[PDB]
Design a protein around this ligand. Structure first.
Ligand code: HEM
Ligand SMILES: [C-]#N
Length: 153
């Protein structure tokens, strides 16, 4: 588990994201698509976008970013007690979108990257360490459901 003190750092950084969900969501999906171009092929919805400028201009992409971050906010707020919220996502990600586990590791890193970019001086080492743990917990739990269904990875 994460300690009560680590969960506090996590939820404290999350309050910063909640101040501007749409902006954070956009920077995160952009960062993921430019850094690991293979991820963009999984989205029939966004596969037409080519440059950073075009990505930035998509209202649909901004809308989807809010959706993703709201789902992840829900999860974090359960402080590890997130089975009901996590099972459905794993199932969809595994069996419908066909997303490999390693891509989840990629969006995790894009999340930490944005947080450093955006709040250079607030988001310190200790908070970074807490966030990392929280994201690994999420990945561990998903992978367990993926193995169950036979998509391990
Ligand atoms: C923080 C990790 C993630 C969260 C919370 C998340 C959450 C969501 C949610 C809530 C949806 C819409 C409902 C659903 O179908 O599940 C969604 C859709 C989708 N997700 Fe994720 N996702 C995550 C990571 C990823 C990654 C890393 C990829 C691919 C690289 C991916 C691919 C997609 C696709 C293809 C869809 C359908 C998009 C569309 O056509 O509307 N997801 N995701
Ligand atoms: C999912 N994005």
């Amino acid at each position: 588990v994460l300690s009560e003190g680590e969960w506090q750092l996590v939820l404290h950084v999350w309050a910063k994201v909640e101040a501007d969900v749409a902006g954070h969501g956009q920077d995160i999906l952009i960062r993921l698509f430019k850094s690991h171009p293979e991820t963009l092929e999984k989205f029939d919805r966004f596969k037409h976008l080519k440059t950073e400028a075009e990505m930035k201009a998509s209202e649909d992409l901004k809308k989807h970013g809010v959706t993703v971050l709201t789902a992840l906010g829900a999860i974090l707020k359960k402080k590890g007690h997130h089975e009901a919220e996590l099972k459905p996502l794993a199932q969809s990600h595994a069996t419908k979108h066909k997303i490999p586990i390693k891509y989840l590791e990629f969006i995790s890193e894009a999340i930490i990257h944005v947080l450093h970019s955006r709040h250079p001086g607030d988001f310190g080492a200790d908070a970074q360490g807490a966030m990392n743990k929280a994201l690994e917990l999420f990945r561990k739990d998903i992978a367990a459901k993926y193995k169950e269904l036979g998509y391990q990875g």
